[PDB]
Amino acid sequence: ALSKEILEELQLNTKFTEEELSSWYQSFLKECPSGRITRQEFQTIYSKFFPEADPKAYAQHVFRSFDANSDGTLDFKEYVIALHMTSAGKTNQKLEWAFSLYDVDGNGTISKNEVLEIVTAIFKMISPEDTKHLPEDENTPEKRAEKIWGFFGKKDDDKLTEKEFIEGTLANKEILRLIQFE
């Protein structure tokens, strides 16, 4: 059974009654006997709802977050893990996963170019309504990219590593809000 395997994943995504993941699967399965969810289709999900904005680039970014998770395609299992990080963790360990979504290239360190991508994509998710309500010296992915990169303290020859990435947030507990894709 699916849930069984995922349950094995344990805390990494225990979620509610893990049995709920089983019923889900059967539903998501019948709703799409595709079995292998491709990035294109997933992008269809975000392109069909998100009326507030057009997180198109963001939807494709998340897909790469758990798709390239050493496999090939986004299976329902990987789908639940995504729906779990989207908004659920609050006391368990998940930052490690954050080091990936915030990194599309692959993994080693987070460079200004890596965040820049997620930042640009996010910008799209931010409709004009809110964007228009932005202060000064901060209205572009390039200007904000300097706010996050500067929040850590890493010049050019300074690639944020997976460790410090967690420490940069351990000290200044004022990042969690910004770093949040939201």
Binding site: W24, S27, F28, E31, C32, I37, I45, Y46, K48, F49, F50, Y79, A82, L83, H84, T86, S87, A88, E182
Partner: peptide, 16 residues
């Protein structure tokens, strides 16, 4: 109840 509409959009979407 709070920021739960996001997870509900990805799942409720691939659902219906």
């Amino acid at each position: 109840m709070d920021f739960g509409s996001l997870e509900t959009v990805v799942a409720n979407s691939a659902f219906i």
